[PDB]
Structure formats: structure tokens, C-alpha cells
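Researcher: Checking consistency across runs. Here is Ubiquitin-activating enzyme E1 1 again:
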Amino acid sequence: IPICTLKNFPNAIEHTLQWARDEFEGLFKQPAENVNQYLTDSKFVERTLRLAGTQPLEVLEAVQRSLVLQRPQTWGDCVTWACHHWHTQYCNNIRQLLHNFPPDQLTSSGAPFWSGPKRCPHPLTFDVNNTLHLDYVMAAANLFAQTYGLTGSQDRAAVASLLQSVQVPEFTPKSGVKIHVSDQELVDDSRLEELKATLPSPDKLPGFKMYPIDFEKDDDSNFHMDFIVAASNLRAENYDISPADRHKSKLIAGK
């Protein structure tokens, strides 16, 4: 499936669910895995650095972000993180896309850009009393907690209460953001060098480790499908795509 359709222009629940699975990997498995490796070899800073064009920074910064910026100390930190991520995916990034391609954007041929296999999205507004919204935080925060070896909670009332005190950084769409429309892909070594002197030294973080999570669609006692269904239906709501319940989702999730 075209990347750009997955990333920016979904039009079917299957695109949404695929995206949700991708999200699960990028949030609860990859970060932890790289972070563990970084804390194991030296061959990591180097090996990773010998990687294809843009990846080096991407990776090295996730590590930085996983070891310092977002490293949680408390369950409330996890709940906060989830709420912030929810805003990033169902609000900020949407507003950014609409910035690069306004609802009334036309093609060079004079046609509407947002037409046909494309659905123009709209940003969501967080609401604790919205089951879907809460479903998402509950699942994401718990999975996020696990990733750091923290105990989570299934107390919806408690999380709802903690959320009342969570403040979201304001967001504003930037100018030079590349959002590809076709599978046509095209500050490089100084941003990179900055990290090399920034990334804490393994020995400066005694016995710190992360717990990568392998996706298991079958264990209903997980939050795995809870996440997939929530992450997916929220994205679907961005793009005016009809939601799929847990059952249809796992059924349409033969993918």
C-alpha cells in the first residue's frame, strides 16, 4: 500500500488499522529495542550512524527522547505522555497537513486536491467524557508504562482525574514541512554531532533498561487490540471514515 496513503491520505478503515499497527511498533517496540542496544554495545552509536541517509538522526534522537525527554518517573507521567501523543496524532499533525494542503487547495489542473480517494481531515478536540478518547489514553499509557517497566492502572476514574491537570503545549503549523503525495522520496551532521555529545553515557544510567513489547492480537487480556481499535477509530474519525468495532477490526485485521 502506498506509503503516503497510509501516512497522510487514508480513505478506508483498512488504512487506519494498518497505521495503528505501525504506531504500536513505533511506540512500544522499536524505541525500547534501540534503547537497550544503545545501552549494550558501542557498535550501536557507530553501526546506526552508518545507516542510510536520514535514519541515523531519526534513530539517535528517538534514543535521546526515550532516555531523557520522555523517560517517565511516574504513572501520571505516562498518562501525560499518552495525552500529548493523542494531541500529536489526532490534532497537531492533522492541523499541519491542513496547513500544507488547505481544504480548498486546488491542483495545477484546477481540480480540488481533497477529492476522490482523498478525504480532507479535521482535527479532534480532547474530551475525557468521550469513551473513545479515554479508551486511547488507558491503552497507550499502560503500554507506555510497560515499556519502562512501570505498573499501570485500569482505573478509568483515576486517569480521568489525573488528566484534568494535564496541560498540552500549544501547537502551530510550521513552514518547511515535507509531506509527500507520491512515493517519491528525496543540519545533517551538526545536529547529529550535537546528539553524540548529548546522549548520556550508558554508565551514567546504572541498571536502566526498557521492555520491548511484541504485538499479540490473540490475548484479549492485553491492551494491544484495545490500542489498535482506539488508535484506528480515532484516525478514522479524523478522516470521516466509519469506525469498526473491536470485532470487525480484528476481523478486518487479517492484515
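Researcher: Does this match what you'd expect to see?
Model: One thing to look at in this run: Residues 75-100 form the longest helix (26 residues).
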